Structure 1
Amino acid sequence: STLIPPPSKKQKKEAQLPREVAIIPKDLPNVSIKFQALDTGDNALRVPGAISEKQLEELLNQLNGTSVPYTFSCTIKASDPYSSLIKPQITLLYTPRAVFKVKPVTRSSSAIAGHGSTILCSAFAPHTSSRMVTGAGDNTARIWDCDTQTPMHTLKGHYNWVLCVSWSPDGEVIATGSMDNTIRLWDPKSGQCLGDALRGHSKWITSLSWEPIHLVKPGSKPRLASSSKDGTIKIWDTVSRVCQYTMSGHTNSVSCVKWGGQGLLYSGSHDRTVRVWDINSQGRCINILKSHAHWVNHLSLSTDYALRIGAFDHTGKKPSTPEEAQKKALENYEKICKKNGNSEEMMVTASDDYTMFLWNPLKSTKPIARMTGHQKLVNHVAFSPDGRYIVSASFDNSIKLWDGRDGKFISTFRGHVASVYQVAWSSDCRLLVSCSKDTTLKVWDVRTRKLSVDLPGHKDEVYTVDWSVDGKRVCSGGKDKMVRLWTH
């Protein structure tokens, strides 16, 4: 075991003396401080004393008339959120917090037996963290009782690998995609298959996307969008289980499809092209984006989190009526969408060309900004729950953070020793769990841009990781065939 060099005798002598008392008697600011909304609003050059964080929060609350805490950041150089009073017009930039705190995850629970093959995918239920479903190489899929950490309501009927598994935003239906050219819908509370398996695809399903609740008709059930390696996408109606519209604009395998909050569908394909499709216009393409040199992998949107957990929140409270659920989903979508002062959603496209592009498909067809610097292909990209930051995973063992507002690079989360497959954002946006080909999982804290804790214990490569809506539990799955649950 190689050890850090020990301190010298001079270091010991220096440390033996007292110093660094935090009396801070007066610390009267030399320059006035003003509050400005981070988004667009400037709100007033005050000259207060050594006011604490609570005092600043109270001042902002009484300015807003709520005396809703906001996180105070200095001028973005310093870029440091009395915290900033040590460095000395000064402007303090604040953003809504959406008060919540996900307890850091540092311990596992147990190693659970199950599928006799590597785990492939997982997804926590949008409404409760007590139930979760994992897809694995074994043809069967199993739902796990996250409380007791035991299998429950095993899904059977498939005859090939369960490539992808997704949970409906309403939490009433589970959609599972397998290497076989079929998709099956299952009741989470019984495991029964909802009618005959969806069929019509010529090749295995690559990804699944559920229609957002706020766009669905009041009282009706959401549709299910699916993508296949053949390059075609079908919009399946969960009621009739029949694909109303088939789209095959992509000339190669479709990497994934994302259902935007505006009703448009954005998908990446192996043809090095990104296409925007509108469900309203009888499922017809509207625009084509051509900037990636290599194929596009894992297209993502800023609103993905809200759409996934539409009508729900970290508290897990369920809606009473369909109208209330739709209203809550619309409010949740607007909260992130209207952060710019106008209804807009950002889209980030990743590709194996060592570059990622930021797009506003509705506003303009040109890329807003180009994110570059990775040494290898970017496997995974995950927008923050509020769109504040963009994080991407690459095979070069490095994870990079980019500003979600303009795509500017922020920092690189170093520490991984193997290719990073996928990452999942925390509900409060404070933490970020990540998995890599190496033997251990890792979680990063965006606030300090530093590693939070290493989570070893997996016996082989880990391909799947997800964070619960409430943030209480984190699941994972890998080549070891053992499903692991992690929580504070």
Structure 2
Amino acid sequence: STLIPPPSKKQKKEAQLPREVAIIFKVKPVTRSSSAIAGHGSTILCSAFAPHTSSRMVTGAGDNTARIWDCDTQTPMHTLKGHYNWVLCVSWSPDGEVIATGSMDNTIRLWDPKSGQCLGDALRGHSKWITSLSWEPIHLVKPGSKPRLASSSKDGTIKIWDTVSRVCQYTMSGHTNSVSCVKWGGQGLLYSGSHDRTVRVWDINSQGRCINILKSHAHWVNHLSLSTDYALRIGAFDHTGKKPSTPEEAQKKALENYEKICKKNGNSEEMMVTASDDYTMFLWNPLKSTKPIARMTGHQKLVNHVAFSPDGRYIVSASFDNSIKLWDGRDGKFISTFRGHVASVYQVAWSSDCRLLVSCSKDTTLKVWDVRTRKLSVDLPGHKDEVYTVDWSVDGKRVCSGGKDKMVRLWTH
């Protein structure tokens, strides 16, 4: 090993002298690993902590049987079954009353957390494998009604789903290529990326009618994201994790948590961002204008992920150049470039306190950065192969990760 060169003898003589006397809510960072959890014999493709508690968690994989996990015991809990193809993606409802996942097969299957049994007949209609999912935010939802579940597929069509009737209340085919992702914003206007090098805001309130079509990327859009996505995903589940006493209380708490972040500038205008393969990223304010507020750029290779900070003050994105790049959340201005990964980054998840950002890459050793110091915090080796996915618990008590090693691993302070 090439150890750091020993200090010069003059440096030791200087160190011998007296020196440098001068009379003149928070999440604990993860720093340690946990026992591996054996499970289905296939590489994990996705993971998502339960919004209401870190003890529950679920992960997809190449095995058809999704496996919920009891993080407190690091043991399998009520393994899911029914799919006949790979579980390409998984997502929890913001209320937490129902789970949703997207199989490589066209079928989609809601699940009940209390037992893991499938919630009715599998959703169907897509001509190609599911790409992403986005539950409707609870604050938009009226009390006493289950949130709608957005869906997307490689064909590029999107079909809003009514979870109660298990039927597609709406459908669209405005994208000529695959929809890389979709998200349900809190303003009531849908947004989604596409492989056709185009983005199209949609107004679900107007029977799904389209209203705008962005067109600035030189290459296909990837991983569309919004500053409000954290509040829209957590479902008004504060870090304490207490369940609201009534559904109307849940609606009020969700509207309050959304207004707290939407009005950071004194006005309700959530920021939006869209990663692209052209080594560029663009801030977006679709309600304000059809053109980007700024053209973020600098990565030497295609960005693989983007994630707004929970407060929205900062933007960050994974890249194939092995150097995550922070950006300002208000204007997209460059801040600092993280480094250390030996291989292309895949995805990252912001800490609930916003002071840290867990990350993973094709290199077996996932890492987490302390954004406040703009420097690496602590490496997290242990995975035997690529860490395809990582996620942070909403309370911050624990972190989970998957990979090609077929050995799920949890992490906590």
What range is the shorter-chain TM-score in?
over 0.9
- SS of the aligned residue for 1:396 comes to coil
For the residues of structure 2 that align with 1:476 and 1:462, how far apart are their CA atoms? 7
Size of the aligned set, in residue pairs, is 413
Question: How far 1:109 moved relative to its partner?
Answer: 1.0
Relative contact order, higher structure (CA 8 A, sep 6+)? 2
For the residues of structure 2 that align with 1:325 and 1:405, how far apart are their CA atoms? 29
Deviation string for 1:337-392 (max 9, x for gaps)? 00001111000110000000000011111111110000100000000001010000
Question: How far 1:255 moved relative to its partner?
Answer: 0.3
For the residues of structure 2 that align with 1:183 and 1:23, how far apart are their CA atoms? 66
For the residues of structure 2 that align with 1:318 and 1:387, how far apart are their CA atoms? 25
Unaligned residue ranges in structure 1 (runs of 5+): 25-99
Deviation string for 1:222-257 (max 9, x for gaps)? 000001000100000000010011011000000000
Deviation string for 1:275-314 (max 9, x for gaps)? 0001000011100000001100000000000000122111
For the residues of structure 2 that align with 1:220 and 1:131, how far apart are their CA atoms? 24
For the residues of structure 1 that align with 2:284 and 2:40, how far apart are their CA atoms? 40
Residues 411, 449 of structure 1: 8 Å contact kept: yes
For the residues of structure 2 that align with 1:444 and 1:394, how far apart are their CA atoms? 15
Per the alignment, residue 3 of structure 2 pairs with: 3
For the residues of structure 2 that align with 1:300 and 1:388, how far apart are their CA atoms? 14
Q: TM-score, normalised by structure 2?
A: 0.99
Q: TM-score, normalised by structure 1?
A: 0.84
Question: How far 1:19 moved relative to its partner?
Answer: 1.7
For the residues of structure 1 that align with 2:205 and 2:349, how far apart are their CA atoms? 31
For the residues of structure 2 that align with 1:191 and 1:258, how far apart are their CA atoms? 25
For the residues of structure 2 that align with 1:113 and 1:104, how far apart are their CA atoms? 25
Q: 2:389 aligns with which of 458, 464, 468?
A: 464
For the residues of structure 2 that align with 1:225 and 1:293, how far apart are their CA atoms? 27
- SS of the aligned residue for 1:342 comes to coil
Residues 310, 333 of structure 1: 8 Å contact kept: no
Per the alignment, residue 482 of structure 1 pairs with: 407
Question: How far 1:168 moved relative to its partner?
Answer: 0.1
Question: How far 1:189 moved relative to its partner?
Answer: 1.1
Is 1:17 aligned with 2:33? no
Question: How far 1:21 moved relative to its partner?
Answer: 1.0
- SS of the aligned residue for 1:368 comes to coil
- SS of the aligned residue for 1:415 comes to coil
For the residues of structure 2 that align with 1:205 and 1:191, how far apart are their CA atoms? 21
Question: How far 1:449 moved relative to its partner?
Answer: 0.2
Question: How far 1:272 moved relative to its partner?
Answer: 0.1
Residues 182, 200 of structure 1: 8 Å contact kept: yes
For the residues of structure 2 that align with 1:311 and 1:376, how far apart are their CA atoms? 36
Unaligned residue ranges in structure 2 (runs of 5+): none
Deviation string for 1:434-454 (max 9, x for gaps)? 000001010001100010000
Residues 310, 332 of structure 1: 8 Å contact kept: no
Is 1:364 aligned with 2:272? no
Is 1:188 aligned with 2:113? yes
- Give the ranges of 4+ consecutive aligned residues of structure 1 lying more than 4 Å apart after TM superposition: none
Q: Per residue, is there more strand in 1 or in 2? A: 1
Residues 338, 344 of structure 1: 8 Å contact kept: yes
Per the alignment, residue 110 of structure 1 pairs with: 35
For the residues of structure 2 that align with 1:196 and 1:366, how far apart are their CA atoms? 42
- RMSD, matched Cα: 0.5
- SS of the aligned residue for 2:379 comes to strand
Question: How far 1:178 moved relative to its partner?
Answer: 0.6
Question: How far 1:157 moved relative to its partner?
Answer: 0.3
Deviation string for 1:83-115 (max 9, x for gaps)? xxxxxxxxxxxxxxxxx1111111111111001
For the residues of structure 2 that align with 1:22 and 1:161, how far apart are their CA atoms? 61
- SS of the aligned residue for 2:325 comes to strand
Larger Cα-atom Rg? 1
- SS of the aligned residue for 1:225 comes to strand
For the residues of structure 1 that align with 2:265 and 2:235, how far apart are their CA atoms? 20
For the residues of structure 2 that align with 1:310 and 1:193, how far apart are their CA atoms? 22
For the residues of structure 2 that align with 1:19 and 1:206, how far apart are their CA atoms? 59
Pairs within 5 Å for 1:60-99: none
Residues 311, 328 of structure 1: 8 Å contact kept: yes
For the residues of structure 1 that align with 2:147 and 2:139, how far apart are their CA atoms? 10
Is 1:222 aligned with 2:147? yes
Residues 209, 258 of structure 1: 8 Å contact kept: yes
- SS of the aligned residue for 1:255 comes to coil
Q: 2:260 aligns with which of 332, 335, 340?
A: 335
Deviation string for 1:408-461 (max 9, x for gaps)? 000001111100000000000001000000010100011000100000000001
Question: How far 1:132 moved relative to its partner?
Answer: 0.2
Residues 256, 267 of structure 1: 8 Å contact kept: yes
Pairs within 5 Å for 1:288-367: 288-367=213-292
Q: 1:264 aligns with which of 156, 174, 189?
A: 189
For the residues of structure 1 that align with 2:338 and 2:114, how far apart are their CA atoms? 39
Is 1:177 aligned with 2:102? yes
- SS of the aligned residue for 2:186 comes to coil
For the residues of structure 2 that align with 1:472 and 1:202, how far apart are their CA atoms? 40
For the residues of structure 2 that align with 1:373 and 1:103, how far apart are their CA atoms? 32
For the residues of structure 2 that align with 1:341 and 1:446, how far apart are their CA atoms? 25
For the residues of structure 1 that align with 2:408 and 2:188, how far apart are their CA atoms? 35
